[model samples]
Target: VETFAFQAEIAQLMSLIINTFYSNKEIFLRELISNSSDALDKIRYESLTDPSKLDSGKELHINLIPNKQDRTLTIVDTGIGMTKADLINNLGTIAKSGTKAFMEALQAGADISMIGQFGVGFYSAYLVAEKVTVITKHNDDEQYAWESSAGGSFTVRTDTGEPMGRGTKVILHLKEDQTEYLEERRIKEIVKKHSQFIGYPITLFVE
Candidate 1:
């Protein structure tokens, strides 16, 4: 296992997002599911020209599994997963994003509707989760797990168990104040409102 701190500047910005900016907590599910869709789209686009890039007859879909006893919600997607380096570079740093520029523009009277121009949507999960675990398997690299409490640092390590084939699974430990996200009906309603038209199937399993 390896431990690393978030990029120095991004650490502070992350707190602001988790604590203030996103007022509607339910949108966290929308952002994550949208990200999953983008991941699936990427592989699908690649497979258009290079059929070998895809695993044999792989079906594209997303699954939401809620565990009431454990107080956890897991979102699994059959999409292009990330490598260790991807986890570090994308999740650990913030400068690579245009979010700063977009925020500056917004302050200067730009449109608020253009928020997705930046890549910070993934961080929305911190709004509801006390701890987040991401297990991903990329076709070209070994499977790995990235975990964080959305604090100053995170840990990443190789996953030794069975691989997810080619996809990503995110496990969110719900915060006490954010328990509504764990409710099956609440999540279903949010998906219906925000992701009903998403190209892939979104199925829910609760226990």
Candidate 2:
């Protein structure tokens, strides 16, 4: 139940990002799946050094479950899940200095093309969500829940359900104006455009 304070500029930046950054509005799914791919890559690298961290009970895959009955969709990945401290540092804070450090590394010929700062990109979820829930299980820690209606404070809690293996599931309660994303055809189109280049498997649940 730790509280966090985000900078005003960070709020402003998040607004701008949700409003204008994505080239296409339907690309939120692609962005999230691409991010999942990156997470899988990180964990794969970690496994080379620590084999014990590789027990997520599922192969690395991204799944889209569109629940038109509830006007919601869930994008899930059995990838490297984030711990509570990671949610605070990686999800709560927007570090401009780290972004600057990355750019500096890129300028100095270090490969940083795959790395991205956290907040700016995650805010893109606001483009389509009236509310979003994150259910995550870190390999070394307990499963937890994170919920937000984007522009509002988020709630985090220790989950009591069956233990979630290492991964993240993003449940989006879609806005009325954005219902087209519920269609499998449309979701695939968006994935092809922005996420097909991602280095992992992305699957849309047709049923």
Candidate 3:
């Protein structure tokens, strides 16, 4: 496992946005599901040019799995996953218009759509999770895991779990007080509200 420090401003950015999301923490799922949709859109667009990209699986969709026993929530997407460098760059560092733009948008009561503009939406995970693990596999690179607890640094390592065809799986170690996210019904409600017209299908597991 190799550990890398977050970009200089990430920790600060995370704190500010996390506090801003206190009133309606449920939007975290909306932010995440939106991101998943974007990722799916990317894969679909790229596959139009290179058909082989769909060799892994063609029916693009998002999966939400809740583990009641572990009190964890997993969101997986069969989309264009991230590479090691993509993980480091995309997840670790915010873009040039990072903090201020995000703040301005949020303070202006901008729609949640403002998230990906500065790559800040993922931090919303911190609102309900103490730790988050991201396992992503891209066609061009080996599978890797990115783990962090909203700390000064995040760790990335080669993933040894069963082979994934292609895509990403985000596992949230939900906080004790945030156990409400462990309910499938609650997540379904949020998805319906925010991602109602998303082009891709979102599936939730059940007994």
Candidate 4:
């Protein structure tokens, strides 16, 4: 396992955004599902030029499984996954040079869509989850799992479960005050409101 800290400014910025800016907690699902669609877009584009790179057997889709008994919600997508290095660069830290500028724009009420530019939307999960676990498999890289509490550090290691084929699965351990996210009705409403037009199918499993 490996550990790393977010740049000081980035950490402060993330804390502010997660704790103060986002008042609607359910938006986490929207941000995540949007990210899944972007991932699918990337893989689909790659498949156009190199068909073998796409998982032929799998149709692009997003799966949301809410486990009431376990107090966990898992969101999986059949999309381009990340390599270990991608995980480190993408998740370990925000761009130091751009952190201040990004912070300023967000403070100025920049559109939420711009958050994706810096890959900060994924941190939205921390708004409602105590911990987030990501298990992903990339076409050119071995499967790996990234776990973090959305604090100062995160850990990544090989994933020993059945191969993912080519995609990502994000498991959210819901917080006590945020358990509403585990409700099927609430999640469905959130999806319709925020990601109804996503190119891929989004399935919710209550069982």
Candidate 5:
């Protein structure tokens, strides 16, 4: 398990993120899967330009699984994966982001209102987790696993398990106080609220 680190402000950022989401913490999953949808859009558009590069077998999907035994929840998607540099700037810091550019475009009269403005949407996973793990494989890169705690440090290593096709998996270790997110009703409500109009299909599971 290789490891990476986060910036100093990530602690406060995580606390602020979770606390602000108190009334809407369930939205974390929706926000996550929504990000996945955007990633798929990217690959799809590129696929139009380069059919040879598309992963036709990996239809975009969202899978939510709750492991009661481990008190864990996993949200997986078959979307674009991040390389190491993408992880650092995207996960560890927020200023340098293509998402930021997307936001600025929207402000400058771009019609992508459904697109989330903040580059920190991925960080919202920490709102419901004590530790967050990301397992991803990029179309152009090798598979890797990334992890972080809200207090500002992360780790990345080549994945050792069975390979996943191009996409990302976000695993959340629910916090004691925020465990309500584990409920199917709660998460479904949030999904409907934040992502019903999302371009991709969203599915959830309970056990």
Candidate 6:
């Protein structure tokens, strides 16, 4: 496993997101699901030009699995999974993004309406989870597991198991007081409210 510190910008954005969204934490689910929906859309778009990418016949969809016993909620999507470099660059640094623009927009009050505009949507998981684990596999790279516990650093390791032939799976380890997120009804309601019209289907492993 290789561990790397959060890039300076991400670390700053991390605290800002966590603290800012404390009162509206339920939207964490919306943000997460939206991210999955985007991933699902990416692979679909890629296969448009190169039909071979869709040869596996894997249905493009999303799954929500909640485990009360473990106090975790996992969102799995059949999308364009990230490579190790992707995991690092996309999640670790903001420089590749319009960091100055995004930071200015966010600082101006972070209207929930503008939630999906920036890639920071993923960090909202920290609002409900003490730790997060991401398992992903891309057509061009080995499967990998990336984990972080609400902090400055994260680790990425090559994974031997193929949870899915291709896509991304994110596991949110719920905090003690945030176990309500593990309930099927609460999650379903959130998904229906935010992503009902999303093109791909989203299945919840109900209790």
On TM-score, who's better, 2 or 6?
6
**C-alpha-based local distance difference test score of model 3:** 0.82
Question: 52-119 in candidate 5: lDDT tens per residue?
Answer: 55663348777777777788888887777777777766555554353455545645765322234555
Evaluated with lDDT, which candidate comes out highest?
3
Q: Over the stretch 1-207, how does candidate 6's per-residue lDDT look in tens digits?
A: 898888766666666666664576788888788888888788899999997887655699888999988888999988888888888775556542644446778678756445557767787788788899999988878889999985779899998775578888999998898988888788878877877787888889976
Off by over 4 Å in 4: 90-99, 109-118
Writing each residue's lDDT as its tens digit, candidate 2 over 1-207 gives 533444444455445444544445665676577667877787788887988777666377788899998998898888888888776566545455544444455457644222344323455576788887888888878888887764636667887766767888888888898889899899888887777777677778875
Please give the lDDT score for candidate 1. 0.80
TM-score, cand. 3 vs. native: 0.90
Compared to the true structure, candidate 2 yields what TM-score? Answer: 0.80
- Model 4, C-alpha of 116: deviation from truth (Å): 4.3
lDDT of 3 by residue, 105-154 (tens): 77788754456566777778888888999999888799999999876788
Candidate 5 TM-score over all chains jointly: 0.80
lDDT of 4 by residue, 20-87 (tens): 74566777888789878988999989888988887533588999999988899999998998889888
Q: Candidate 6: TM-score?
A: 0.90
Residue 98 CA displacement from its true place in model 5, Å? 10
* Candidate 5 global CA lDDT score: 0.70
Q: Which stretches of candidate 2 lie over 4 Å from their true place?
A: 1-5, 17-23, 94-119
Where does the lowest 10-residue lDDT sum fall in candidate 6? Answer: 92-101
Per-prediction TM-score to the true structure, in the order listed: 0.88, 0.80, 0.90, 0.88, 0.80, 0.90
Off by more than 4 A, model 3: 18-21, 94-96, 104-117
